[PDB]
Every structure is written in structure tokens, then in C-alpha cells.
Swiss-Prot record:
UniProt-recorded name of the protein: CREB-binding protein
Region (Interaction with histone) location: 41-87
Renumbered residue ranges of the record's region Interaction with ASF1A: 79-97
Domain comment (free text): The KIX domain mediates binding to HIV-1 Tat.
Species assigned in the record: Homo sapiens
Range within the parent protein: 1084 to 1197 of 2442
Described purpose of this protein according to its UniProt entry: Acetylates histones, giving a specific tag for transcriptional activation. Mediates acetylation of histone H3 at 'Lys-18' and 'Lys-27' (H3K18ac and H3K27ac, respectively). Also acetylates non-histone proteins, like DDX21, FBL, IRF2, MAFG, NCOA3, POLR1E/PAF53 and FOXO1. Binds specifically to phosphorylated CREB and enhances its transcriptional activity toward cAMP-responsive genes. Acts as a coactivator of ALX1. Acts as a circadian transcriptional coactivator which enhances the activity of the circadian transcriptional activators: NPAS2-BMAL1 and CLOCK-BMAL1 heterodimers.
Recorded disease: Chromosomal aberrations involving CREBBP may be a cause of acute myeloid leukemias. Translocation t(8;16)(p11;p13) with KAT6A; translocation t(11;16)(q23;p13.3) with KMT2A/MLL1; translocation t(10;16)(q22;p13) with KAT6B. KAT6A-CREBBP may induce leukemia by inhibiting RUNX1-mediated transcription.
Entry PTM: Methylation of the KIX domain by CARM1 blocks association with CREB. This results in the blockade of CREB signaling, and in activation of apoptotic response. Sumoylation negatively regulates transcriptional activity via the recruitment of DAAX.
Subcellular location, record wording: Cytoplasm; Nucleus
Record annotation: effect of changing residue 33 to R: Impairs binding to acetylated histones
Length: 114
């Protein structure tokens, strides 16, 4: 079992690492709004939207009971972008960078948590 503040402390660096990627975090710092973007098909393809600001709020408000729930949300964010977007699009390429950063940061953290 994990204490919520200790879980948040252990995982925050990996979230910070994502946020610090400039420009690659920028499309992910806030939710995709399909109405503002005029992409009505978005929620037909992305059933469970996720972004860095939502992940932050969850990490901050004790919404992850276990480390894997956070990891799943990070992966959901990535998979949504890789499903919806063209491989050579800015969003898709930016997403691949965040995943590269995340895989490098998360792995030693989960080993210390486990």
C-alpha cells in the first residue's frame, strides 16, 4: 500500500520531465477540445481522452492509488495521439518524444517503488 503524498513525490519528477519538453509537451499541456478545433470525429476515435493537465490534477488529488494507474494514464495520452494523428504530424512526432522521455524516467522509479 502507498501513502498518497509519497506516491505523488516518487512520480512527480517523471511528470515534470514530460512538461519540460519544449516544444514537444505543448500539444499535451491541456485537453484536446474537438468543438474548438472543429474535429467532430475525435471522440469517435478517442473514447477516453487524457492530457498532462488531467494527469497532474489526478497525481495531486490522490486519484492514483497505485503506480500503474498513473503509467496507464500516461500511455492512454500517448495512444490517443498515435491513433488519431498522422505518423509524421507534429502531434504524433511530439508524442513519440514524450514517450521516449517517459520510458527513460518511469523505469527506475517503478523499480524503486517495487
Amino acid at each position: 500500500i502507498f501513502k498518497p503524498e509519497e506516491l505523488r513525490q516518487a512520480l512527480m519528477p517523471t511528470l515534470e520531465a514530460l512538461y519540460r519538453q519544449d516544444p514537444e509537451s505543448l500539444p499535451f499541456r491541456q485537453p484536446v477540445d474537438p468543438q474548438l478545433l472543429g474535429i467532430p470525429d475525435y471522440f469517435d476515435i478517442v473514447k477516453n481522452p487524457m492530457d498532462l493537465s488531467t494527469i497532474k490534477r489526478k497525481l495531486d488529488t490522490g486519484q492514483y492509488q497505485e503506480p500503474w494507474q498513473y503509467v496507464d494514464d500516461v500511455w492512454l495520452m500517448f495512444n490517443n495521439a498515435w491513433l488519431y494523428n498522422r505518423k509524421t504530424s507534429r502531434v504524433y512526432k511530439f508524442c513519440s518524444k514524450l514517450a521516449e522521455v517517459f520510458e527513460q524516467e518511469i523505469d527506475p522509479v517503478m523499480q524503486s517503488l517495487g
